[PDB]
Amino acid sequence: QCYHGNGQSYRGTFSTTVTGRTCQSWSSMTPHRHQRTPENYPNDGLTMNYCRNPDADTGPWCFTTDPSIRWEYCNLTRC
Ligand SMILES: NCCCCCC(=O)O
């Protein structure tokens, strides 16, 4: 349930936002269109809709399935 450092190395199966939203899959362009695809970042573990941090943010995050909300941090603690 926890990520180390900045979450850059996190490769867990959590997929829920802090708000309790569900993560959009990185390969998906819906509802939010973006460029952080497993296609463009083949080495950042952009697998299914798992919380990740391909941009060196401060914790694992994801795009959200809430059309209203583009992205949020995931509901995780820092180890
Ligand atoms: N760390 C969250 C980033 C928000 C924008 C991501 C993107 O639009 O590629």
Swiss-Prot record:
Primary gene name: LPA
Superkingdom of source: Eukaryota
Effect caused by changing residue 71 to R: Loss of lysine-sepharose binding
Name of the protein: Apolipoprotein(a)
Note: Apo(a) is known to be proteolytically cleaved, leading to the formation of the so-called mini-Lp(a). Apo(a) fragments accumulate in atherosclerotic lesions, where they may promote thrombogenesis. O-glycosylation may limit the extent of proteolytic fragmentation. Homology with plasminogen kringles IV and V is thought to underlie the atherogenicity of the protein, because the fragments are competing with plasminogen for fibrin(ogen) binding.
Domain (Kringle): residue spans on this chain: 1-79
Residue pairs linked by disulfide bridges in the UniProt entry: 2-79, 23-62, 51-74
Positions annotated as glycosylated: 75
Known partners and oligomeric status: Disulfide-linked to apo-B100. Binds to fibronectin and decorin.
Family: Belongs to the peptidase S1 family. Plasminogen subfamily.
Described purpose of this protein according to its UniProt entry: Apo(a) is the main constituent of lipoprotein(a) (Lp(a)). It has serine proteinase activity and is able of autoproteolysis. Inhibits tissue-type plasminogen activator 1. Lp(a) may be a ligand for megalin/Gp 330.
